[PDB]
Design an enzyme around this catalytic site. Structure first.
Site, PDB file in Angstrom:
ATOM      1  N   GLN A  17     -33.090  21.215  -4.435  1.00 20.47           N
ATOM      2  CA  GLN A  17     -34.440  19.944  -4.167  1.00 20.47           C
ATOM      3  C   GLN A  17     -34.834  18.700  -5.554  1.00 20.47           C
ATOM      4  O   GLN A  17     -35.199  17.905  -4.912  1.00 20.47           O
ATOM      5  CB  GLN A  17     -35.713  20.927  -3.095  1.00 20.47           C
ATOM      6  CG  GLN A  17     -35.438  21.588  -2.236  1.00 20.47           C
ATOM      7  CD  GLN A  17     -36.414  22.100  -1.269  1.00 20.47           C
ATOM      8  OE1 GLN A  17     -37.059  23.506  -1.364  1.00 20.47           O
ATOM      9  NE2 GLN A  17     -36.454  21.304  -0.561  1.00 20.47           N
ATOM     10  N   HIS A  37     -21.389  15.998   1.070  1.00 16.14           N
ATOM     11  CA  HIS A  37     -20.928  15.932   0.731  1.00 16.14           C
ATOM     12  C   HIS A  37     -19.666  15.432   1.885  1.00 16.14           C
ATOM     13  O   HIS A  37     -18.856  14.968   1.935  1.00 16.14           O
ATOM     14  CB  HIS A  37     -20.050  16.252  -0.657  1.00 16.14           C
ATOM     15  CG  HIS A  37     -20.607  15.523  -1.839  1.00 16.14           C
ATOM     16  ND1 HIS A  37     -20.347  17.154  -2.800  1.00 16.14           N
ATOM     17  CD2 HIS A  37     -21.798  14.806  -1.708  1.00 16.14           C
ATOM     18  CE1 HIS A  37     -21.346  16.736  -3.733  1.00 16.14           C
ATOM     19  NE2 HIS A  37     -22.310  15.306  -3.025  1.00 16.14           N
ATOM     20  N   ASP A  50     -27.598  15.154  -4.373  1.00 18.50           N
ATOM     21  CA  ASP A  50     -26.749  14.488  -6.099  1.00 18.50           C
ATOM     22  C   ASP A  50     -27.070  14.869  -7.275  1.00 18.50           C
ATOM     23  O   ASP A  50     -27.491  14.614  -7.958  1.00 18.50           O
ATOM     24  CB  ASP A  50     -25.586  13.064  -6.028  1.00 18.50           C
ATOM     25  CG  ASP A  50     -24.352  13.491  -5.172  1.00 18.50           C
ATOM     26  OD1 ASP A  50     -23.869  15.183  -4.340  1.00 18.50           O
ATOM     27  OD2 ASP A  50     -23.518  12.456  -4.429  1.00 18.50           O
ATOM     28  N   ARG A  75     -43.484  28.080 -10.488  1.00 21.96           N
ATOM     29  CA  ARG A  75     -41.934  28.706  -9.824  1.00 21.96           C
ATOM     30  C   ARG A  75     -41.180  27.348  -9.593  1.00 21.96           C
ATOM     31  O   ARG A  75     -41.108  26.771  -8.447  1.00 21.96           O
ATOM     32  CB  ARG A  75     -42.654  29.374  -8.179  1.00 21.96           C
ATOM     33  CG  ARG A  75     -41.612  29.778  -7.511  1.00 21.96           C
ATOM     34  CD  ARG A  75     -42.195  30.428  -5.703  1.00 21.96           C
ATOM     35  NE  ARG A  75     -41.308  31.341  -4.883  1.00 21.96           N
ATOM     36  CZ  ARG A  75     -40.461  30.377  -3.916  1.00 21.96           C
ATOM     37  NH1 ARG A  75     -40.675  29.070  -3.780  1.00 21.96           N
ATOM     38  NH2 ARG A  75     -40.108  30.869  -3.024  1.00 21.96           N
ATOM     39  N   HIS A 120     -32.137  30.126  -4.172  1.00 18.22           N
ATOM     40  CA  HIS A 120     -33.250  29.586  -3.281  1.00 18.22           C
ATOM     41  C   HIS A 120     -31.928  28.844  -2.242  1.00 18.22           C
ATOM     42  O   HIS A 120     -32.599  27.745  -2.130  1.00 18.22           O
ATOM     43  CB  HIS A 120     -34.574  28.994  -3.256  1.00 18.22           C
ATOM     44  CG  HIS A 120     -35.472  28.107  -3.081  1.00 18.22           C
ATOM     45  ND1 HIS A 120     -36.622  28.127  -3.354  1.00 18.22           N
ATOM     46  CD2 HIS A 120     -35.010  27.553  -2.161  1.00 18.22           C
ATOM     47  CE1 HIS A 120     -37.349  27.384  -2.443  1.00 18.22           C
ATOM     48  NE2 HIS A 120     -37.018  26.720  -1.607  1.00 18.22           N
ATOM     49  N   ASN A 164     -35.709  33.412  -2.070  1.00 22.52           N
ATOM     50  CA  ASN A 164     -37.126  32.372  -1.264  1.00 22.52           C
ATOM     51  C   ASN A 164     -36.572  32.519   0.264  1.00 22.52           C
ATOM     52  O   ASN A 164     -35.670  31.650   1.097  1.00 22.52           O
ATOM     53  CB  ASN A 164     -36.413  31.437  -1.268  1.00 22.52           C
ATOM     54  CG  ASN A 164     -37.728  30.583  -0.734  1.00 22.52           C
ATOM     55  OD1 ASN A 164     -38.690  30.489  -0.949  1.00 22.52           O
ATOM     56  ND2 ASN A 164     -37.228  29.050  -0.433  1.00 22.52           N
ATOM     57  N   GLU A 165     -36.584  33.036   1.470  1.00 21.25           N
ATOM     58  CA  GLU A 165     -36.964  33.017   2.932  1.00 21.25           C
ATOM     59  C   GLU A 165     -36.165  33.497   3.761  1.00 21.25           C
ATOM     60  O   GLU A 165     -34.589  32.258   4.029  1.00 21.25           O
ATOM     61  CB  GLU A 165     -37.002  31.370   3.241  1.00 21.25           C
ATOM     62  CG  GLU A 165     -38.610  30.822   2.093  1.00 21.25           C
ATOM     63  CD  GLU A 165     -39.097  29.200   3.970  1.00 21.25           C
ATOM     64  OE1 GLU A 165     -38.140  28.805   4.398  1.00 21.25           O
ATOM     65  OE2 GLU A 165     -40.477  29.453   3.253  1.00 21.25           O
ATOM     66  N   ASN A 305     -45.064  33.080   1.863  1.00 24.53           N
ATOM     67  CA  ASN A 305     -44.668  31.556   1.728  1.00 24.53           C
ATOM     68  C   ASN A 305     -44.758  30.989   3.332  1.00 24.53           C
ATOM     69  O   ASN A 305     -44.738  31.834   3.597  1.00 24.53           O
ATOM     70  CB  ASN A 305     -43.284  30.929   2.434  1.00 24.53           C
ATOM     71  CG  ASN A 305     -42.840  30.685   0.987  1.00 24.53           C
ATOM     72  OD1 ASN A 305     -42.859  31.048  -0.330  1.00 24.53           O
ATOM     73  ND2 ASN A 305     -41.267  30.380   0.508  1.00 24.53           N
ATOM     74  N   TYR A 307     -46.749  28.196   6.635  1.00 22.31           N
ATOM     75  CA  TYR A 307     -46.920  26.975   6.708  1.00 22.31           C
ATOM     76  C   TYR A 307     -47.827  26.857   7.858  1.00 22.31           C
ATOM     77  O   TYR A 307     -49.160  25.790   7.903  1.00 22.31           O
ATOM     78  CB  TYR A 307     -45.028  26.243   6.610  1.00 22.31           C
ATOM     79  CG  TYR A 307     -44.778  25.895   5.658  1.00 22.31           C
ATOM     80  CD1 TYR A 307     -45.359  24.888   4.328  1.00 22.31           C
ATOM     81  CD2 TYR A 307     -44.150  27.159   4.706  1.00 22.31           C
ATOM     82  CE1 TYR A 307     -44.630  24.386   2.808  1.00 22.31           C
ATOM     83  CE2 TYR A 307     -43.845  26.414   4.003  1.00 22.31           C
ATOM     84  CZ  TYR A 307     -43.711  25.092   2.938  1.00 22.31           C
ATOM     85  OH  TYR A 307     -43.541  24.756   1.365  1.00 22.31           O
ATOM     86  N   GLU A 372     -45.615  29.835  -1.390  1.00 25.16           N
ATOM     87  CA  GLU A 372     -45.424  28.755  -0.908  1.00 25.16           C
ATOM     88  C   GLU A 372     -46.412  28.847   0.459  1.00 25.16           C
ATOM     89  O   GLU A 372     -46.796  29.126   0.900  1.00 25.16           O
ATOM     90  CB  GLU A 372     -44.299  28.169  -0.426  1.00 25.16           C
ATOM     91  CG  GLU A 372     -43.141  27.999  -0.964  1.00 25.16           C
ATOM     92  CD  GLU A 372     -42.208  27.180  -0.731  1.00 25.16           C
ATOM     93  OE1 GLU A 372     -41.312  27.354   0.439  1.00 25.16           O
ATOM     94  OE2 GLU A 372     -40.945  27.799  -1.099  1.00 25.16           O
TER      95      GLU A 372
END
Length: 462
Positions: A17, A37, A50, A75, A120, A164-165, A305, A307, A372
């Site tokens: 990310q 890509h 990229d 993290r 991740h 992660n997740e 995590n 949200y 998160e």
């Protein structure tokens, strides 16, 4: 209420990310490189990782910002294919190892604790060509990857997240929601979850036997999910449905790690749905006795995590993100909605309070680190809705701590920087710090939320 002096505040990013440098210094192709890509149209704003925030080159600036915030920890994740381009650990790339050593050492010289996420979502493409996480051999490949991470970094890194997740990793195989963008449905969903769990257990036990005696660190797994509440709070039926939905969402991963085996309610429902489909064996794989023992007790703290939340009642949901084997349909309380475009993350701070209580009761009040939490928007500098989300969720956390005695030890904002939000590209901005993705220098600009969070970290008062 205020957060105690020893409370740990941090922030999180992830390798794909923010890093860029996607084909630099011998780094191997990963499944996200492959996706952006070769199926660029899958990213809603036509962008890719990229370059991203160019943190492969700009990491010292990232650390300087973390230091200005005076955070206790950072993290970040490690790109497997930077360490071993094929994912197989017989061929290591020293330049990739050097990057993470440089970042770790930069953090430590600034008195910031590194908290490292091993995986991740950026699987080396060679390993995906074997089938990736739906191939059971992948847990042995992960074990060897973890071995290398402990070997090179564990003298300094004392806080680890394996996965992660894992639910999101599964959705990349089952419902075309993430790389590798497959549509294997619930069969693939559970195969990917099972392999990640065995991988987690193997890594934890390897750590215990071979590294912990001299390194003295801690490991967890960042378990995520939508939190579910009964549509009618007075309905026993809806209460039952919410419990089933919650076990399917996060108990899937937490029950094996904390209690032993999958949730009983998942065994019941998946085995029955599988029978209804005429399948020769259940879609939910069966752990052996030895595997149940391998996995039970493999978390030194609970990593959450979180949200958002939804209401549920028995039924069928058109959104494939909600597991159809659990027969619930989601809805959004009118109180949570406003007369405008719905935000990416619907604010339901009460959901975090209730989730913390749910976790306390289900798992015996483990020390819990929120790895998160955050809110994403159109990227304006006056990000007042983001501030309100953070404030309200922080206050929900304090309520859980002091009213309900939840053992919460820290909180992590997603994210320090705007970054590549997967299939949404750069179009959703979670950063305390704005990034100009049209500027070759990827210039950072602090948002209003940056100053807000800086002040919360200093005073402990949301």
């Amino acid at each position: 209420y205020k957060f105690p002096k020893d409370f740990m505040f941090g922030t999180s990013t992830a390798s794909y990310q923010i890093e860029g440098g996607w084909n630099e210094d011998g780094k191997g192709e990963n499944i996200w490189d492959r996706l952006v890509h070769t199926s660029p149209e899958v990213i809603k704003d036509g962008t890719n990782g990229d370059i991203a925030c160019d943190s492969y080159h700009k990491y010292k600036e990232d650390v300087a910002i973390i230091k200005d915030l005076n955070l206790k920890f950072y993290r970040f994740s490690i790109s497997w294919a930077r360490i071993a381009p094929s994912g197989v650990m017989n061929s290591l790339e020293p330049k990739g190892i050097a990057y993470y050593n440089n970042l770790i050492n930069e953090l430590i010289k600034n008195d910031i604790i590194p908290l490292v996420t091993m995986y991740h979502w950026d699987l080396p493409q060679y390993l995906q060509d074997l089938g990736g996480w739906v191939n059971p051999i992948m847990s042995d490949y992960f074990k060897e990857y973890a071995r290398v991470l402990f070997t090179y970094f564990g003298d300094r890194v004392k806080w680890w997240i394996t996965f992660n997740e894992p639910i999101a990793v599964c959705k990349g195989y089952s419902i075309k929601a993430y790389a590798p963008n497959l549509n294997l449905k619930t069969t693939g969903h559970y195969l990917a979850g099972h392999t990640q769990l065995i991988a987690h257990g193997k890594a934890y036990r390897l750590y215990e036997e071979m590294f912990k005696p001299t390194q003295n660190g801690k490991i967890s797994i960042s378990i995520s999910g939508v939190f579910f509440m009964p549509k009618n709070a007075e309905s026993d039926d809806d209460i039952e449905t919410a419990e089933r939905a919650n076990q399917f969402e996060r108990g899937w991963f937490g029950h094996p790690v904390y209690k032993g085996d999958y949730p009983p309610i998942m065994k019941k429902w998946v085995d029955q749905k599988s029978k209804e489909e005429g399948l020769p064996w259940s879609k939910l794989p069966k752990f052996t006795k030895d595997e149940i023992k391998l996995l039970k007790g493999t978390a030194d703290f609970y990593a959450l995590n979180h949200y958002s939340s939804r209401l549920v009642t028995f039924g069928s949901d058109p959104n494939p993100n909600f597991n159809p084997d659990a027969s619930y349909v989601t809805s959004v309380d009118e109180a949570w909605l406003k007369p405008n475009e719905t935000p990416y993350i619907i604010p339901v701070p009460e959901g975090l309070r209730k989730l913390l209580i749910w976790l306390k009761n289900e798992y015996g009040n483990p020390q819990l680190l929120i790895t998160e939490n955050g809110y994403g928007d159109d990227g304006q500098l006056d990000d007042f809705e983001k501030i309100s989300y953070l404030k309200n969720y922080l206050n929900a956390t304090l309520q859980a701590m002091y009213e309900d005695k939840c053992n919460v030890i820290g909180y992590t904002v997603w994210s320090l920087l705007d970054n590549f939000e997967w299939f949404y590209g750069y179009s959703i901005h979670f950063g305390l710090v704005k990034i100009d993705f049209n500027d070759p220098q990827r210039t950072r600009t602090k948002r209003e939320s940056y100053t807000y969070f800086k002040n919360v970290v200093s005073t402990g008062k949301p």
